[PDB]
Amino acid sequence: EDLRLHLLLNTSVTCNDGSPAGYYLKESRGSRRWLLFLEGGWYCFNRENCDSRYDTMRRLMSSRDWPRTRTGTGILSSQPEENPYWWNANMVFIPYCSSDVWSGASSKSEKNEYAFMGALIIQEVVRELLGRGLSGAKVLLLAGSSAGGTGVLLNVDRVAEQLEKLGYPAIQVRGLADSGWFLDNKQYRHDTITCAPTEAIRRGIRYWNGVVPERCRRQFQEGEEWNCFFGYKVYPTLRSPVFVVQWLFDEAQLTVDNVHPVQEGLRLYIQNLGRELRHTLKDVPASFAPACLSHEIIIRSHWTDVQVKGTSLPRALHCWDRSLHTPLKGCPVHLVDSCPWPHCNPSCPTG
Numbered sequence: 473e474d475l476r477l478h479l480l481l482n483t484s485v486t487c488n489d490g491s492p493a494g495y496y497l498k499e500s501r502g503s504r505r506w507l508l509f510l511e512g513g514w515y516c517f518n519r520e521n522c523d524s525r526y527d528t529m530r531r532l533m534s535s536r537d538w539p540r541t542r543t544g545t546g547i548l549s550s551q552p553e554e555n556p557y558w559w560n561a562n563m564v565f566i567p568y569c570s571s572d573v574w575s576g577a578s579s580k581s582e583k584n585e586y587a588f589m590g591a592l593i594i595q596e597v598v599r600e601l602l603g604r605g606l607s608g609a610k611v612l613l614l615a616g617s618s619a620g621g622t623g624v625l626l627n628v629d630r631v632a633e634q635l636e637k638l639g640y641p642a643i644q645v646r647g648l649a650d651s652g653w654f655l656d657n658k659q660y661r662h663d664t665i666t667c668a669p670t671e672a673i674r675r676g677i678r679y680w681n682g683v684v685p686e687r688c689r690r691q692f693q694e695g696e697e698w699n700c701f702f703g704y705k706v707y708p709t710l711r712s713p714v715f716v717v718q719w720l721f722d723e724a725q726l727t728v729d730n731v732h733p734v735q736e737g738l739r740l741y742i743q744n745l746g747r748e749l750r751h752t753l754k755d756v757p758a759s760f761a762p763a764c765l766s767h768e769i770i771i772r773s774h775w776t777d778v779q780v781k782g783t784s785l786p787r788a789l790h791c792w793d794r795s796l797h798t799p800l801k802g803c804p805v806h807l808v809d810s811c812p813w814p815h816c817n818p819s820c821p822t823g
């Protein structure tokens with residue numbers, strides 16, 4: 473259990489129920505690389521569906537029952553056999569306890585039953601880590617899976633601005649967004665369960681006092697900031713380098729699309745979803761998008777097994793690092809499958 477819990481010293485920065493937020497840390501004294509990982513786990517967007525989440529997903533809304541340690545897995549592992557990419561880095565796991573896709577800036581108060589502080593949690597973790605060795609870093613990689621991957625897209629440029637304003641312009645801030653690149657597409661068939669993500673995010677932003685990156689906000693303007701939660705719309709507005717990992721047939725995407733022998737209508741729907749996803753990645757130079765039906769990858773212990781065009785994700789990330797020192801021979805960073813059906817790639821996770 474190699475990462476140790478630290479609750480935030482600023483106890484005004486809280487989980488949904490007012491308990492302090494926090495982070496799990498494993499330092500690597502001989503390293504100037506820092507990996508800050510944002511946990512996922514959907515979201516809630518009104519009193520009734522947040523109350524239900526508090527009953528059966530309470531660790532996603534409160535720190536009162538968190539364990540003192542967590543084991544680092546996948547990209548958070550310190551063993552080179554499990555993590556060829558960054559096994560020697562300083563490792564930070566930030567639990568998701570704000571239910572706001574890491575976008576909120578609202579406290580619990582006489583008018584708010586819950587606090588939605590995801591964007592402030594990230595900034596306060598960064599602030600407190602500067603005193604624990606981050607001040608010496610060369611690279612800060614903000615990574616995340618699922619809602620945490622969307623959280624990377626929403627917060628990577630604000631972390632860069634924070635460090636510049638605090639006096640640390642030499643720390644290179646980068647993002648790694650895993651399974652958080654969603655499409656606001658037409659559902660296959662069309663309350664909490666009946667609310668499409670565009671409408672649920674629109675309501676969430678108001679409930680959370682949600683915030684989005686500045687350039688994206690200026691493009692879409694008031695009332696339309698929900699657009700910035702969709703990767704293909706927010707990514708072109710970002711200045712920090714961001715590596716995008718996305719299954720072409722993501723299970724959470726299919727869930728919001730109301731998809732579960734496949735006949736022609738659904739066959740064409742699935743094939744068109746894969747084609748649309750591949751199209752949105754055409755101009756993303758650092759990306760890894762295998763043709764599999766799955767969800768999340770980078771903190772799985774067997775994350776090294778999947779390959780696109782014969783290149784694994786830890787290798788692609790290493791090639792990305794090299795590229796950030798014109799292309800590299802045999803060290804690709806843009807890896808998007810072209811085959812049109814789940815598991816047409818033989819290295820897909822077996823389940």
Ligand SMILES: FC(F)(F)c1cc(-n2ccnn2)ccc1Cl
Nearest residue numbers: 513514618619654669701724728
């Ligand atoms: F696809 C959606 F629904 F749009 C989407 C899905 C999530 N999600 C799923 C699991 N964890 N977070 C978050 C934001 C968005 Cl935008």
Ligand SMILES: *[C@@H]1O[C@H](CO)[C@@H](O)[C@H](O)[C@H]1NC(C)=O
Nearest residue numbers: 481482483484485592593596
């Ligand atoms: C604590 O965090 C709050 C909320 O982000 C911030 O406004 C304030 O500057 C911090 N206060 C203290 C006492 O650290």
